[PDB]
Every structure is written in structure tokens, then in C-alpha cells.
Design a protein around this ligand. Structure first.
Ligand SMILES: *[C@@H]1O[C@H](CO)[C@@H](O[C@@H]2O[C@H](CO)[C@@H](O[C@@H]3O[C@H](CO)[C@@H](O)[C@H](O[C@H]4O[C@H](CO)[C@@H](O)[C@H](O)[C@@H]4O)[C@@H]3O)[C@H](O)[C@H]2NC(C)=O)[C@H](O)[C@H]1NC(C)=O
Ligand SMILES: *[C@@H]1O[C@H](CO)[C@@H](O[C@@H]2O[C@H](CO)[C@@H](O[C@@H]3O[C@H](CO)[C@@H](O)[C@H](O[C@H]4O[C@H](CO)[C@@H](O)[C@H](O)[C@@H]4O)[C@@H]3O)[C@H](O)[C@H]2NC(C)=O)[C@H](O)[C@H]1NC(C)=O
Ligand SMILES: *[C@@H]1O[C@H](CO)[C@@H](O[C@@H]2O[C@H](CO)[C@@H](O)[C@H](O)[C@H]2NC(C)=O)[C@H](O)[C@H]1NC(C)=O
Ligand SMILES: *[C@@H]1O[C@H](CO)[C@@H](O[C@@H]2O[C@H](CO)[C@@H](O)[C@H](O)[C@H]2NC(C)=O)[C@H](O)[C@H]1NC(C)=O
Ligand SMILES: *[C@@H]1O[C@H](CO)[C@@H](O)[C@H](O)[C@H]1NC(C)=O
Ligand SMILES: *[C@@H]1O[C@H](CO)[C@@H](O)[C@H](O)[C@H]1NC(C)=O
Lengths: 422, 331, 422, 331
């Protein structure tokens, strides 16, 4: 018992060229039936399956981003020089010292030390509580790959198409030419927590002249610590008959603190299925912010005679149902697809009713029995859902009671207004 | 009233953990320091060790007209954080609470820092209670944690790695450590300053014979961590941070180098440091590294020598507060 | 004196994305005027210039293709063995010998030698007149590059965009993603004469098992000669009381002869501006049989304030004309373009009249006077041709009496039927 | 009537070029070979050298019952291509035409190959004319070239490189060469077979003393090319093709190895070769390489030894026809 739920029939009078713009986290399923222009009853299946985008980024390990606390201390001496004694800030992890050597007058002098031009006033800015807050990587190069499978008549061919490669067969050619990317080289990816949580994108990550407060000021490189300088100047505040204290009118908040303050002003990104090594970082972008340009061309010299002997026979039967026919609940259909006269055959099964088809599922069937699950949403009260191939469907169906990041394009003519609100 | 906050976990768990909290109080005059007694109204079992009399060499400086006169004498203090061996390590089992203070002093005034350590069961028995120190009242507040599996660290809920093998997120946590005097009859296993010297020295120091160790608590609650534990990554981390920040991690005016006799009965100088004025910043208590038998020092207005690269006249602090990065999971 | 011959004005309410399919031997010129959506009178020029396609093919030098003549000789001996004496064919360049050792009966024997099983009949096939007819190269890898220049407001940026690279600026991004190619790896390019004359494409170029008649049978490799075997078998034709002659029923014509016979059955290609080295072969394909997919995107955060201060002023004047206004003859116009307040400015001049514009010329003007030639075809009797920028044109014009592999796209509204046959 | 085609260039040009053509005629019986005289009705100035009497050793084989009997004797031939030194080299200046034949023979019959060489001016004076040889008439046809700058080669118009320095298309052209006997008093500069031996030998041959050289014409017209000219790429090419195809480049039945005495007055064998029957294929004339003074051989039914890798009993052919690749431009 078959029903008119076939695929788009395309006569091969001329070559079949196609251009695609695949989103980042999207898998395409384009299938038609190429018709011999010399015989209306000679048709061969053509299936095109393209996977998601795999982003391969050769990166440079920048290290760990450290967060510290600002501290300032002052050290006064009556006689000697500033380069004679030691100070507790000189032994810290990061420290910057500005000393007023031989600048002991009398207005800044304490009640002790009745001398002029003989003392020393050293000021030390150091950072404590250094703790790692995230990991930083720098993009060196980018590479985008997609896995494509074709099914023409009885032939099946698969390949991982790169930017400098194409899946070329005797009749079909699939090329990957362009890629619009959110990421580009010389960018800095910062992961605050683990990888799966995503991260942020920084462009002006300081490398040579880092200051306290800039993104990347304090870094825990594998060679050692890399401390920045300060954004400000020193000054000596003093009163009469008091020890001269040291002031610093500059930036006090660290780079991580300012980043948390204005985190909304930076670019965010997510990752899925991450794989990081000592040289690369592979992941799939789920935000669908990248587009790949794919060119497919099928010549009209298909030789319909060679692709017609012993085609792939497919039988199916609906065996189980679970869910509801309401628009929003969804139902799950189980099909027992039996493939014969072919070792492997790439096609797709649809869950159809008397009128429409509310779901599809692409699967590479093996010679024998195959269990296929199909998800669907919609239907009416008396909708008897069945499993369906191109034209042939199951003998019986089942009835129910009371997105997925896949794209299906089979060229089937959808039902008009007669199937709306019935 | 000061505030000593205790962060309470949701469960007791494996039994051997302690809670810890601490607060630095306002300045008191020096003359009052010798009278300071910790009082408690709390419903816990105070360990009596720390409130006994404990001999210190007091080392002080005065301006003179290098430009300094120092002097020293032997006095008895009470209530300081001189914890005997095993007391902290077995507190979870004994159900004893340790309450003691350290002193951060200039020439004229001291800020006591009160430390409270005790069993996690205290969190079941107690919401708040009071400690007194001289004329100051301290409100201890036991507060239940925002987190489900860990502790609130830098505004983030964190659980550190637990396995004994090698395998994560990284969070910086507070560590608080107490110096414990502990001798053995034979060998160098307890020569703590030798451990520092291997980490930060070029050449061989002759005589750093102090015998003891640090006992530390990590974050607001943990099992005690013994320093040094040679194959423990956290011990290694604490020791390295100690070696670079020997007075702990976190206006004071430096005046110059001073020396003195500790104990005061020594004929020549056995200690050095840096005299300062202004606001006390670091703790003013430690032990000479040179003597097997501990010589305890209280040096108000002087940052006693703690640089481990130096051979002579150096010290170890009685308490030490710093931060180490831990690997784990943020949740 | 200006006339409404402006470019396409595009309001920047949203981002401007574009997809291009450039032919092989084609240069594109896309220019518009991006308008500030907050001020109708604030417009900045946007120019996009893309050069022709440069094909870089890492090749393998196969050597020279040799052409020879088929020859067969026979040598008979009465006593001894075939591996005892020498033959004149053994010293040739290419030779294949099949001998009937010890097969001397009596029906094939001459009037002499009344013996059985003692003679020797050697047959030698050799090739003479070996002369080179062409050079062969084998494609190992392919690379396609295009040089692109952008002009936005007062900024000018150029770069050679590869397949793994993009011209990325603060507001414009040009990427090269896909390339539909007539050539693909493992192909054999054969040049009969010089390079500029083009060549042929061979797929089944014999490498291991070469036979006489196949493309690539006799090769003059730099190591030495590489001779093939023969497509046939030997036989001994003999009569009574006659010396046994040797026959060879196989292929006689060489590989070059058969290639000349069926030359029309092979793929041909042309080259322009060739550059060959010991490792590569660079050329531009003039047949326009390759298509490059280019993606251009301009963000709407153009900051019209920064790109408005001190724009590029351009003055022009028509100074010479030469040709006719007939549809087919063509005319050449000379313009004296004066660029001020900008060091370099990329734009294009058009040869317009009161109604239409019959030609254009893109040039990167320098600060000062610039002589620009414009070719045009068309016009009427009273057509006074003038030089024109976007809006401003020259003060006067000139009148006449009695493709180029460039593509121009400025978005200007062309004249309707009012300019046809007037 | 045979046909001897001369391809005529459009211009004379630089003056020193010659035209050349050749044709192989049908078989004549051996007894008639000694009577063969070239006659000419052509309007050109025949050089008289080649029609004089020239002494050859005739070397022949017969079946016997290794299975061969060979014999030899001294006879005089006329009209063969034994061209004296300078005759071809200066023919453009002297305006002399050389017409002579070589012989390609089996035991019973010979095919003469007639060679005609002469000044390019003949192309102005002459459209066609007749040569006779015995009972055969030869039609010489002078035909103007399809090309503008070069010569029709393999159906293609070709012009070779002209510069003396090093710098193109490649075309294979015919080369025809004539052996010239030429002695010097001192040294090895004219020892032609030594040149072959350096190119194709492992070890040292003792006695290959023939003194002479080849003079060659390239294509249908060229200046004479002297072999060997050591630094000339074309000389190198001709010599290498000679070394691999010593009887020239282009059913015959091989019978076996034969030896003989040349001249016949020698007490032992001085020559070897391969006896054959059937259609004559190669020329049957040459010179012994062993003697300074040329010993000319005519060996009908025998391919005389020309393999340069052999040391003894070998020969050089009187004429040699082959092909070499030339760099140039096809147009
Ligand atoms: C050891 O450290 C202690 C504590 O850090 C320190 O003693 C304190 O010094 C401050 C300032 O030197 C004292 O502050 C005073 O507080 C009274 C309280 O009412 C104020 O009225 C005073 O104000 C006057 O003085 C200021 C002088 O600059 C003026 O700006 C102001 O307008 C007023 O005229 C005054 O600030 C404080 O009382 C003591 N604290 C204690 C506990 O005694 C001490 O100096 C350090 N010792 C050394 C040797 O450095
Ligand atoms: C030296 O070379 C010469 C020339 O290549 C060669 O002499 C020639 O031999 C052929 C065949 O052996 C002779 O051909 C004959 O021609 C006459 C002319 O009318 C024919 O009638 C003959 O035909 C009969 O013989 C054939 C035998 O197979 C039959 O197939 C046929 O039907 C006829 O019965 C015959 O073919 C030719 O005449 C001579 N040429 C000369 C110039 O004498 C000679 O054999 C070679 N010598 C040696 C020793 O190898
Ligand atoms: C810790 O002590 C060591 C030894 O006294 C100090 O090291 C010296 O420091 C000065 C200046 O930095 C150098 O010129 C010397 O060469 C160092 N000597 C040695 C032996 O290392 C070190 O600076 C002290 N650290 C402090 C005061 O923080
Ligand atoms: C030319 O002469 C040489 C020497 O007689 C021949 O070389 C010998 O050939 C045989 C078989 O090819 C080899 O087994 C010997 O090792 C060769 N000997 C030397 C010394 O090279 C050569 O074959 C002859 N060429 C011919 C008859 O064409
Ligand atoms: C990452 O995923 C979260 C999930 O809620 C989403 O809100 C966010 O927009 C995603 N990131 C980007 C850049 O789209
Ligand atoms: C090469 O150029 C010639 C010029 O006439 C043209 O006829 C031929 O078609 C071109 N080759 C191809 C493959 O288009």
C-alpha cells in the first residue's frame, strides 16, 4: 500500500548544479530522483548528506590568567642609600618599586633624623593572592572540514571535504570553497571554567606592554611569571614632623576585576564536542554563526543503464508508536526497514499519514533488517501514522492520543490549506 | 564587636575535617598585651594548652642619637597560638576547639588576630556565640554555605580534587598555618628551615637546627595539612608561597636595619630585622631557626628576618596566612 | 556642471553581505555609496576591485614525449644458440626481441642447414627516428589566488586573498572559500609547442605498464630512456626450402600518431602569462572555465564620523576624443583627473553623455594630475561625450563622427527605452 | 623513374648552405654494379672526383658443408661516395655539385642510393632534370618550400637555433653524413674511431688508427657540419646516434658470424661481420678502423662489424643516415 509521498523528480536534460550555505551547527539532507530524459519510468535516487562543521584551530598556549590584589608599602631610612637595604616587597611575585634616593629634605622629615640629603624613601607596589582564573589561547591558523556522503543509484561514496579538497566521482562533484567565520587569526580565546562552558574572545590582548588592569596583565607562563607594570605615577605625601608616607594615584583594580565589571562588552562563544591537544583545538560551534559555501554538480552523462541493473530494494513496516498527535507534544515511530539486493544503501524514512509527512530520519541501511526511529510533531485525531519510503509505505499504521539541528530537503510537494486546522 | 565568621558545610562527611575562622581586632596599647586573656561563652570544649604561660624574648627598638637602640628581655605571654603537637591533627576526634591569637605590633600598639579552629559538629550546636579579648567582644557567626558540594571561594562554589593519584578548574584558596615545635632524637627529618633552604638556596648553611612543622587548614574547612608532606602537591605549594612571602600574603614606614640578642642573655646578636613605624602590617611573633630548642620572639615595631636565602639571624613566623591555587571543579 | 549619473546608494540599516562567482579570466569592479541611516547627506564611497585568477600548480616534470617508427628484422642461424650471437637491433634505443631458441624443425628450414633442433630464429622489434614532440607535466597540487583591493571612505587596503586567507579590516571582510576548477590533481598536461600555444589534458597517461601506442609510451626522462613493451604477439611464417621470416600482428602506429589521429577526443586548454619553475607552473586561464566563490561583508558600525573628515576631492576635465559614435566602431576619451586632499584614492571614471554612460575605467589615482583613458561604444550623432565621476562631470565635452574581460557594477540606473534607436 | 626531391628555401641567405637530396633505387644484379656510371643532363657543375676508379676489397660469403666460406679480392669501383677533403665544405663557394651513390647489397643484388649535394643557387636555375644510373632514370625535382623561415619537417615548418652561446620547440631532423679520409703527420686529432671509443668504452683499445672525419648535412639544406666538432651540440648528438645505430636509422634473415681478410693479401683475418640473406637493409660499404691508410670494403650479403664497443676487426660506414632532435621555433 503506497501513497504519493515521493521525492522531487528532476529530468536530466542539463547538468544539475547547486550552491549551498550551510550554517555552523546544521546538517543538510538533500535528496531527489534523477530521471532519464529518454524514459519517464527510469529514475535513480540521488542522496546528499553533509555533516556539521568541524573547526580546527592551530593555537598558541598563552598560559593561565592570574588575579591579584593591589598593595602599597613605604620604607624610610635616615642614613645610607636606597640600594643598600632590602624590603619585604622585593621578594613578592610581582613588584614595582620607585625610590626617592638622596631626596631627604626637611619638610618631609620625621621628628627623628635632623639631616638633609642623606635619607632614603622607598615605595613598593606588590601583588598578593595570585590565583588562576582562566586559560588563554591565541589563534594561529584556522581550518574548516565537513564530512559528505553521496548516494547515486547503487554507488555510495563518502569523504571528508576540506577547503583544499573536493569529493570528486565519475558523475558527482562536491567542493567546499568559502567559509564565513566569526573567528579569525590573532584572536585570544579565554576559558574561565572548563571547555564545554564556552569562553570569551579578546582582540587587544596585551603581549609586549602590559599594564595592571589590561586583559592579560598577570600571566602564569610555563617558563615562569610574567608581571606587568603599573598605570600611574608615584608621589610623596608628607607633613611636618611626620614620617613621609607614599601615595599612588593610579589603577587599583586588576585586569580580571575590570573584565568581570564590563564582561558584557566582550564577544562570547560556545563549543560542543571539544578536543584540545598541544597544538590544536577542535570543536563544533553550536551558535550557528558560521556559514560554509558548498558547490555540487552532477553531470547529465549518468549512464542510466549501468545504474539501473539490480537496484536497492527496500521494504518497511510500522511496529511501534509512542507520543501524542498534538502540535507540541511529539511522537516517536519505530520502523523495521529491510534492505535487499544491496550491501549498503543510503536513504531516509519518513513518518507520513494519508495526507502529510510530519518527520523524517536519514539512515545508511545494511543488507537485512534495520530498526529506524522517526520523531514527528503534528497530526490530527484520526491520523494513522505509517512508515514510508519514497513511494511505498507500510501495510498498516498506528494512532496516538491527546530544532534538532537537522535540515530536510526532499522536494516533496507539501499539502496546501486542506491540511490546516482539520 | 568584631566578627569571626565560620562557613559551615551541608554535611560532616568523612569525619576528620575542622572549621576555621579568624579576625584581626583593633589596636591595643603594648602594656595591655601581657594582660590579654581569651574568654568564651561558646558551647564548645576549649583546649587549655594555649592559655598557659609561654616564655618569649621581647625585642624592641628606640630612636637614639646607627640611629637605633635595641633591647631585649624574657617575659611570659599567654593565649598566643603556640599549639602543641597533635592537638590540631586530632581535634576532630577529641572534639576540642582551639582558640588563640597572634600579635601584629608597632612600637606602641598591637592588633591581635584571633583564630578559632574546631570540629565541624560545632555547626550543628551553634549559630552564634561570644569571645572576649581584653575589652573587645567578638561575635562568632556560624553561617550555612550557599554551595551544595563545596565552599564559597572568591564568590564561586568550588570542590577540590580528592584522589591520591594524578589525573580541571583552578581556584585560589586561603591557607592558614600554625608553627608547631616538635623534636626527634636522631637525624634531620624535623629540620624545617633546611626544607626552605633546599628550595631557595645556592650554597650550604651551617646551623639551622629548629625542629618542627606547620599544621595548616585550607579554606574555611578541611582536614589538617602537615608541612612538609614531601609528595603532596599542596604542601609544595604552601612551602613555595612561604618561601616567596615569608610574612604571609594580603602606611607602614621602614626606618632601617636592627639587630639584637635572643634570648637577652646571649653575649652577641642572634637576630636581625627591619625597624618600622606606622601601622602594624605583619605579625610580630616567630622562632629563631638556629636553635633546636625553640627561642620564641615577640618583636614589636620590627619585621624580624624571615628571608630564607639568608643563613644567620633568621626566623620562622608562628602563624602564616596565604593563598594557593587548587585544581578541582567549580559546579 | 554635474549630471545624475551617480552610483547605487545603499542605506546601512543592516550589514551588507555579498556573494560572488567570478569567472576565471574576469576582473570585477563593484562600487556603491554607503549611506548613514541617520543623515541622508552623509555618504561614503565603497569600492571593491578583484583581479583575475592566478592558478598555481605544483607539478612533476614527466620529461619529453618521443615519437619513433616501427621496424622489424629477422636473424637466422644454422648452429649454436640464440644467446650466443649479437644482433643489430640489440644496440638500438628501444628494442624488444623474441627468439625461437632450439626450435629449428625442417618445414621452416632453408635450402641450407639440413638439421633439426639445432638452429636459432631471433626476431627484433626496434624503434628509430626518435624525436621529441612535446613536454609532459603531472599535477600534484593546485592553488588559486586573487588580488583584491578595497576603498572605504578614506581608507585603502589591498591583499592577495588565498584559499586559506581573507582580507579582513575593521569594517570590511573579503574571503575566498570555493573554486570550481576544470583541472584537478593527477592530470597530465602536454604542451606540443611552446607554453603560450596551450596544450592538452590526459588522464590515463601510462606510468607503469606502457605499450606502443599509449599516451606516454616512449619518454625521454632526465635519468634516461624509458621504452615500453609492444601490444601484440610474434609468429614464424615460413615456406618450404626458404628462410623463415618473422611476422608481428600488432600495433604499428606510435602513441603520437594515434594522438594526432584522434586529437579531437582530448581536452584542450589555453594559458596566458605563464611562469614555469623547477617545481610549479603559474598561469591565468583565459577560457573562463573556472569560478571562484568570494564572500564580502561590511558591518553597519562604519562610524560615518571618522570616515567623513577630509574626504577625497576629485576634479576632472575632458581633453581629447578619438573614434566614432557608431555601435561597433568605438571611441577613446582622455580625462585629466585631479585628486586632492588624499594621497591615494581608488575610484573609476565613466565616459557619459546627457543620458547614458558608454564606458568606464577604474584607476587608483595619486595626489595630483592623472591622465585616464576610457573606451566606449555607442552614442548618437549629437552625443557630446564627457568625463564623469560619481556625480560631478567636466564642464565641456566632445563629439565624434560616423569583451575586454572586465565587469563593471556600480548600481547606476540605466536609461530605459527613451535611449534606444534615437 | 625514381624521384630525388630537393626542398628549396625562399632565399639563399648567408651564402654557405647546400641543398641535399637522396633516393634508394631498385635492386640490380651484382655483376652490373662494377659497370654503374652516373650520367647527368642537369645544368650544374659536377665535381669529377667521385667518378674516378677507387680500390675496394670485395668480401663475399657462400654456404658450405662453420657453415660458411668467405673470400675476398681487390677491385676498382667507380661513382661511390668517397668524397675528398674540402669538396663538400667549399662547394657553396666553388659552385660544385656532388653526385655519387652508396650500395646496399645482399649476396646477389644491390640497391644503389644516389646522393645529390649542391649549391642553393641550383634552385634558381633548375625545376627538374635527369640523372641516369645503369638502366634507371632519376627525376630530380626542385620544389619550393611551404615555409617562410624554415623547412618542412614531419609536416611542420621549423627554424633551428642560430646563436653561438646558450639560451624552445624541439623537432627531429634527418642528418646525412659522408666519411672523409684525411691524415695528419703528428698526433691523434683525426683518429675518428678513438672518439667513438671514449664515448662507448670501458677499457683501452690498442690499434684503431683510421684518420678521417664525417661531413654532414642537416635536413634538406644546411651548412656542412664537421664530425667531430667537440664543443658543438649537434656533433655530439650525431656521434651518440652513430654510436647506438652504427649502420644508420630508419625481411632480412640473419645466418651467422663470418670473418675475412681485408685486404685479401693479409695472411690472417682483419674483419668480421654477420652474414645475412633476404632484402638488403643497411649499406654494404665501409673502412677498417685499424689502418691509418683507409682499407675500403664492399661486403655484399654481410653486415660488417660496426659496434664501437668491440676492439678488433671493426669498421666505419662510408655514409650514414639518421635523425637528431634540434631546439628551435615551429612558427
Ligand atoms: C602604632 O599604630 C597605632 C594604630 O595604627 C598608631 O596609633 C594611632 O595613631 C593615630 C594617628 O597617628 C591616632 O589617631 C588620633 O585619633 C584621635 C581619636 O579622637 C583623633 O582625635 C586624632 O585626630 C587628630 O590628629 C590628626 C593628626 O594628623 C589630625 O588629622 C586630626 O584632624 C586631629 O587633629 C588622631 O588622628 C590614634 O589615636 C592612635 N591609636 C592608638 C591605638 O593609640 C600609632 O601611631 C603607631 N605607633 C607608631 C610608633 O608608629
Ligand atoms: C637479394 O635481394 C633481391 C631483391 O630483394 C632478391 O631477389 C628477388 O627475389 C624475389 C623473391 O624472392 C623475386 O621475385 C620474383 O619476381 C618475379 C617477377 O615476375 C615473379 O614472377 C616471381 O613470382 C613467383 O615467385 C613467388 C615465390 O614465393 C610466388 O609467391 C609467386 O606467386 C610466383 O610463383 C618472384 O616473386 C625477384 O625477381 C628477385 N629480384 C631480383 C632483382 O633478382 C634476392 O632473393 C636476394 N638474394 C638473396 C640471396 O637473398
Ligand atoms: C634575600 O637574601 C638574599 C641574600 O642576602 C638577597 O640576595 C642578594 O640580593 C641583592 C640585590 O637583590 C643581589 O645583588 C645579591 O647578588 C643577592 N645575593 C645572593 C647571595 O643571592 C635577596 O635580595 C634577599 N631578598 C629580599 C631582601 O627580599
Ligand atoms: C657490442 O660489443 C660489446 C662487446 O663485445 C657487447 O657487450 C657484451 O654483451 C653481452 C650481452 O649483451 C654481455 O653479457 C657482455 O657482458 C658484454 N660485454 C662487454 C665487454 O660489454 C655488446 O652486446 C655489443 N652490442 C651489440 C651486439 O649490439
Ligand atoms: C551559548 O549558549 C547559551 C545557552 O543558553 C546561549 O544563551 C548563548 O547565546 C550561546 N552563545 C552565543 C554566542 O550564542
Ligand atoms: C583557446 O583559444 C582559441 C583561440 O581561438 C579558442 O578557439 C579555443 O576554444 C581556446 N580553448 C578553449 C579550451 O576554450
Amino acid at each position: 500500500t503506497d501513497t504519493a509521498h515521493g521525492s522531487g523528480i528532476i529530468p536530466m536534460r542539463t547538468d544539475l548544479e547547486l550552491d549551498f550555505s550551510l550554517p555552523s551547527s546544521a546538517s543538510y539532507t538533500y535528496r531527489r530522483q534523477l530521471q532519464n530524459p529518454a524514459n519517464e519510468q527510469e529514475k535513480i535516487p540521488f542522496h546528499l548528506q553533509i555533516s556539521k562543521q568541524v573547526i580546527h584551530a592551530e593555537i598558541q598556549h598563552l598560559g593561565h590568567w592570574m588575579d591579584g590584589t593591589f598593595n602599597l608599602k613605604t620604607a624610610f631610612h635616615c642614613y645610607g642609600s636606597c640600594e643598600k637595604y632590602a624590603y619585604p616587597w622585593q621578594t613578592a611575585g610581582c613588584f614595582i618599586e620607585k625610590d626617592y634616593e638622596y631626596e631627604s629634605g626637611w619638610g618631609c622629615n620625621p621628628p627623628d633624623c635632623p639631616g638633609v640629603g642623606t635619607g632614603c624613601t622607598a615605595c613598593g607596589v606588590y601583588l598578593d593572592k595570585l590565583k588562576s582564573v582562566g586559560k588563554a589561547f591565541k589563534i594561529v591558523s584556522l581550518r574548516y572540514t565537513r564530512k559528505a556522503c553521496i548516494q547515486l543509484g547503487t554507488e555510495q561514496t563518502c569523504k571528508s571535504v576540506d577547503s583544499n579538497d573536493c569529493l570528486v566521482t565519475t558523475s558527482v562533484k562536491v567542493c567546499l570553497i568559502g567559509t564565513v567565520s566569526k573567528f579569525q587569526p590573532s584572536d585570544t580565546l579565554l576559558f574561565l571554567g572548563p571547555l564545554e562552558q564556552g569562553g570569551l574572545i579578546f582582540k587587544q590582548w596585551c603581549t609586549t606592554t602590559c599594564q595592571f588592569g589590561d586583559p592579560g596583565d598577570i600571566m602564569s607562563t610555563p617558563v615562569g611569571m610574567k608581571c606587568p607594570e603599573l598605570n600611574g605615577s608615584f608621589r610623596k605625601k608628607c607633613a611636618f614632623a611626620t614620617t613621609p608616607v607614599c601615595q599612588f594615584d593610579g589603577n587599583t583594580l586588576s585586569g580580571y576585576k575590570r573584565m568581570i565589571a564590563t564582561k558584557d562588552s566582550f564577544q562570547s562563544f560556545n563549543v560542543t564536542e571539544p578536543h584540545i591537544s598541544a597544538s590544536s583545538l577542535e570543536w563544533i560551534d553550536p551558535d550557528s554563526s558560521l556559514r560554509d559555501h558548498i558547490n555540487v554538480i552532477v553531470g547529465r552523462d549518468l549512464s542510466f543503464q549501468d545504474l539501473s541493473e539490480t537496484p536497492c530494494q527496500v521494504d518497511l513496516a510500522t511496529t511501534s508508536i509512542d507520543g501524542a498527535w498534538g502540535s507540541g507534544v511529539g511522537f516517536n515511530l519505530v520502523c523495521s526497514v529491510s534492505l535487499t539486493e544491496c550491501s549498503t544503501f543510503l536513504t531516509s524514512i519518513k513518518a507520513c499519514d494519508s495526507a502529510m509527512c510530519y518527520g523524517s530520519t536519514t539512515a545508511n541501511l545494511l543488507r537485512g533488517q534495520n530498526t529506524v526511529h522517526i520523531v514527528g510533531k503534528g497530526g490530527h485525531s484520526g491520523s494513522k501514522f505509517m512508515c514510508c519510503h519514497d513511494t511505498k509505505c507500510s501495510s498498516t499504521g498506528l494512532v496516538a492520543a491527546a530544532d534538532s539541528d537537522k535540515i530536510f530537503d526532499d522536494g516533496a510537494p507539501e499539502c496546501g490549506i486542506s491540511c490546516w486546522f482539520t | 564587636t568584631g566578627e569571626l565568621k565560620i562557613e559551615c558545610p551541608h554535611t560532616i562527611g568523612l569525619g576528620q575535617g575542622l572549621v576555621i575562622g579568624s579576625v584581626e581586632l583593633p589596636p591595643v596599647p603594648l602594656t595591655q598585651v601581657e594582660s590579654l586573656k581569651l574568654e568564651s561563652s561558646c558551647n564548645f570544649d576549649l583546649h587549655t594548652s594555649t592559655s598557659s604561660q609561654q616564655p618569649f624574648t621581647k625585642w624592641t627598638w628606640e630612636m637614639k642619637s646607627t640611629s637605633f637602640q635595641t633591647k631585649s628581655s624574657e617575659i611570659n605571654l599567654r593565649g598566643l597560638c603556640l599549639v602543641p603537637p597533635l592537638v590540631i591533627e586530632t581535634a576532630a576526634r577529641t572534639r576540642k576547639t582551639i582558640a588563640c591569637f597572634d600579635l601584629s605590633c608597632n612600637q606602641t600598639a598591637c592588633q591581635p588576630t584571633v583564630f578559632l579552629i574546631g570540629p565541624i559538629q560545632t555547626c550543628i550546636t551553634t549559630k552564634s556565640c561570644l569571645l572576649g579579648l581584653g575589652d573587645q567582644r567578638i561575635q562568632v557567626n556560624y553561617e550555612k554555605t550557599y554551595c551544595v558540594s563545596g565552599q564559597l571561594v572568591e564568590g564561586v562554589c568550588f570542590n577540590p580534587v580528592h584522589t591520591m593519584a594524578l589525573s580541571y578548574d583552578i581556584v585560589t584558596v586561603m591557607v592558614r598555618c600554625f608553627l608547631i615545635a616538635k623534636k626527634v632524637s636522631t637525624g634531620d627529618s624535623m629540620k624545617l628551615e633546611k626544607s626552605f633552604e633546599t628550595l631557595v638556596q645556592k650554597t650550604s648553611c651551617t646551623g639551622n637546627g629548629f625542629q618542627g612543622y606547620y599544621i595548616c587548614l585550607v579554606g574555611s574547612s578541611s582536614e589538617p595539612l602537615y608541612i612538609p608532606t614531601l609528595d603532596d602537591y599542596r604542601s609544595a605549594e604552601v612551602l613555595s608561597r612561604m618561601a616567596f612571602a615569608p610574612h604571609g600574603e594580603d602606611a607602614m614606614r621602614i626606618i632601617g636595619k636592627v639587630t639584637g640578642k635572643a634570648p637577652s642573655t646571649e653575649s652577641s646578636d642572634t637576630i636581625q630585622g627591619v625597624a618600622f613605624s606606622g601601622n602594624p602590617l605583619y605579625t610580630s611573633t616567630g622562632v629563631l631557626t638556629a636553635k633546636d630548642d625553640p627561642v620564641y620572639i615577640w618583636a614589636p615595631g620590627i619585621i624580624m628576618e624571615g628571608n630564607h636565602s639568608v643563613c644567620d639571624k633568621k626566623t620562622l613566623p608562628l602563624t602564616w596566612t596565604g593563598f594557593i591555587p587548587l585544581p578541582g571543579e567549580i559546579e
